[PDB]
Amino acid sequence: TTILAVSYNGGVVLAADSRTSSGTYVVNRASNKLTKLTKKIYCCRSGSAADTQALAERVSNYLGSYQTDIGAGVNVATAANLFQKMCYMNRWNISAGIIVAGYDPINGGSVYSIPSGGSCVKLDYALGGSGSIFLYSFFDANYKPGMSKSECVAFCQRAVAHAYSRDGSSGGLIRTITLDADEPEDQTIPWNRSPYCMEKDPKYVTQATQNQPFSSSAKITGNRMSST
Amino acid sequence: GHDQSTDVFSAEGRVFQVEYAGKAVDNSSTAVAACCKDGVVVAVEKVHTSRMLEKGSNNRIHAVDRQAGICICGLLPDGRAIVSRARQEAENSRDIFATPIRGSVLANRVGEFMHAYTTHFAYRPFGCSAIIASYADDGPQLFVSDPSGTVAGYYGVALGKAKTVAKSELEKLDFSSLTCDEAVGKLASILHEVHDKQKDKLYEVEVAWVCDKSDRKFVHVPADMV
């Protein structure tokens, strides 16, 4: 799993790969890990599909009740707070990295990370999933904040692609959604138009030279490609 | 009693059992070899005792690695022992050091091994000189290790019974200019001149090379060039 969210001026992007794996087999290659909580507030789920689907459904339910009751929009902080509560109450029995991100008019776009222990941290961007370990340096090196919506979408797609090109546990599509004052725009990049992969990076086209032919010299030539 | 074991010096600091093994090599069939700029050619006169051998019998020329070979002169069985040791060294170089054994190294190893059997009362010296022909990263190389274990590099070399004549004929060649193609002709020709016919009535001449044309692989030369 690779999930992330990034703020831009006036909203957020969420992004995720689509793969759900039972270890080394892919049970679902088109999962949707961007889960709607309210109209403009989403979570990205990582960890146990079961656990995260159960919490998201629970929180989305509570939040719809709450919106009907106060007769007004919900804040992202409220959604994060609830998520945090539930994640923390059940911290021993669930595996669950969440990101809660969305747009509310009081605070603009926000991002909260709620990692396994049930901390809740408000950030500019957040990463989660097994694939996130691959993006920390990518962000450190290549993410400048203050990006436009469209730049930010493309950057999150790149970021996911980089992650899932190295994490065996992430893969498939890249789903994104933006969340701001306007209508949510979901997008889905199929793998074969991924903005990065190792199988198409020109610096990984030359094969490692492992299967040298038997020679009278130490000079390395190439792999032996044919018997003759 | 000065001459019964190789573990013993004579009063002049000779080791007779080595000189004696030496004589085994000199009473043997003749070999020659030439180290050109494009490779090494080694040829050797096989003397049969029977008219009924298979062609191929008692090869005196053995590959030791892709790029190296040993032509034995003297007791063939003793040589196959050296050839086995050379092959173990070549394998070691590839297995441990992931490189083909350089020829100077191979010949040194061969020499060390032969010399070892001149030091200890329990073994005798080998009755064979090995000619080593390599063409590894050190270039074309031709060494000879004699029964004492003394090793020397040569441009051209002759061993066995006609060695003194064959050397006179090898001196007429121009080693700076000579090519492996020409040498197969010359070296074989030489072994036909110095062969004595009324003694050793049955003989073929086995030739092998390692050169740029053979893709620096050590091989018998096709029997069209002879």
> Three-state SS string across chain B, please?
CCCCCCCCCCCCCCCHHHHHHHHHHHCCCCEEEEECCCEEEEEEEEECCCCCCCCCCCCCEEEEECCEEEEEEECHHHHHHHHHHHHHHHHHHHHHCCCCCCHHHHHHHHHHHHHHCCCCCCCCCCCEEEEEEEEECCEEEEEEECCCCCEEECCEEEECCCHHHHHHHHHCCCCCCCCHHHHHHHHHHHHHHHCCCCCCCCEEEEEEEEECCCCCCEEECCCCCC
Q: Are A5 and A13 in contact (CB under 8 A)?
A: yes
Shortest CA gap B214–chain A (Å) = 11
Q: Are A19 and A172 in contact (CB under 8 A)?
A: yes
Q: How far is CA A160 from the centre of its chain?
A: 6
User: Active-site residue A24, yes or no?
Assistant: no
**Strands annotated E in chain A:** 3-8, 11-17, 20-22, 25-28, 34-38, 41-47, 96-104, 108-114, 121-123, 125-128, 174-179, 185-189
HSE-CB of B33 using CA atoms within 13 angstroms: 33
Residues 174-193 on B with a CB inside 8 Å of A are none
The DSSP 8-state label assigned to residue A92 in this structure reads T
Q: Is B213 on the interface with A (CB under 8 A)?
A: no
CA–CA separation, B113 vs B169, rounded Å?
A: 31
Q: Are A79 and A63 in contact (CB under 8 A)?
A: yes
CA–CA separation, A126 vs A132, rounded Å?
A: 9
Rounded to 10 degrees, what is the CA torsion of A2, A11, A73, A79? 30
Residues 82-121 on B with a CB inside 8 Å of A are 99-100
Q: What is the count of structural domains for chain A?
A: 1
- Residue to substitute from B40, B66, B93, interface A, most A β-carbons within 10 A: B66
Query: What resolution does the deposited structure have, in angstroms?
Result: 2.6
CA–CA separation, B204 vs B128, rounded Å?
A: 20
- Dihedral sign for Cα A203, A209, A211, A216, please: positive
Q: Are B136 and A219 in contact (CB under 8 A)?
A: no
CA–CA separation, B41 vs B187, rounded Å?
A: 8
CA–CA separation, A170 vs A161, rounded Å?
A: 9
Indicate the angle between helix axes B103-116 and B76-96, nearest 10 degrees: 130
The DSSP 8-state label assigned to residue A119 in this structure reads -
Reduced to 3 states, what is the DSSP secondary structure of residue A142? Answer: helix
Q: What is the count of structural domains for chain B?
A: 1
The DSSP 8-state label assigned to residue A197 in this structure reads -
Number of H helices, E strands in chain A: 4, 12
The string of DSSP letters for A128-139 reads: ESGGGGGTHHHH
- Residue to substitute from A216, A220, A228, interface B, most B β-carbons within 10 A: A216
HSE-CB of B125 using CA atoms within 13 angstroms: 31
Shortest CA gap B122–chain A (Å) = 37
CA–CA separation, A224 vs A220, rounded Å?
A: 11
Determination technique for this entry = cryo-EM
Task: Tell if the CB–CB gap between B100 and A219 is shorter than 8 Å.
Answer: no
Class of residue B68 by CB neighbours under 10 A (exposed 0-12, middle 13-18, buried 19+): buried
CA–CA separation, A64 vs A36, rounded Å?
A: 11
B63 - beta bridge partners? Answer: B69
CA–CA separation, B37 vs A38, rounded Å?
A: 83
Q: How many CB atoms lie within 10 A of CB A155?
A: 23
B177: containing domain: 1-226
The values of phi and psi at residue A211, to 5°, are -120, 65
Angle value at C-alpha B137, between B210 and B90, nearest 5 degrees: 70
List of residues 6+ apart from A76 with CB closer than 8 A: A41, A100, A101, A102, A103, A104, A107, A109, A110, A112
> What is the interface size between A and B, counted as CB pairs within 8 Å?
21
A192: containing domain: 1-228
Cα maximum dimension of chain B: 53
The values of phi and psi at residue B136, to 5°, are -105, -150
Question: Long-range CB contacts (< 8 A, 24+ apart) of B76-79?
Answer: B76/B128, B78/B126, B78/B127, B78/B128, B79/B126, B79/B128, B79/B130
CA–CA separation, A176 vs A195, rounded Å?
A: 14
Q: Is A216 on the interface with B (CB under 8 A)?
A: yes
Q: Are A120 and A113 in contact (CB under 8 A)?
A: yes
What number of residues does chain A have? 228
Q: Is A219 on the interface with B (CB under 8 A)?
A: yes
HSE-CB of B197 using CA atoms within 13 angstroms: 2
CA–CA separation, A119 vs B164, rounded Å?
A: 94
Q: Is A220 on the interface with B (CB under 8 A)?
A: no
- Nearest C-alpha in B relative to A214: B66
- Dihedral sign for Cα A72, A76, A77, A79, please: positive
Q: Are A159 and A139 in contact (CB under 8 A)?
A: yes
Task: Provide the b/e sequence for B141-158 (b: ≥16 CB within 10 Å).
Answer: bbbbbbbbbebeebebbb
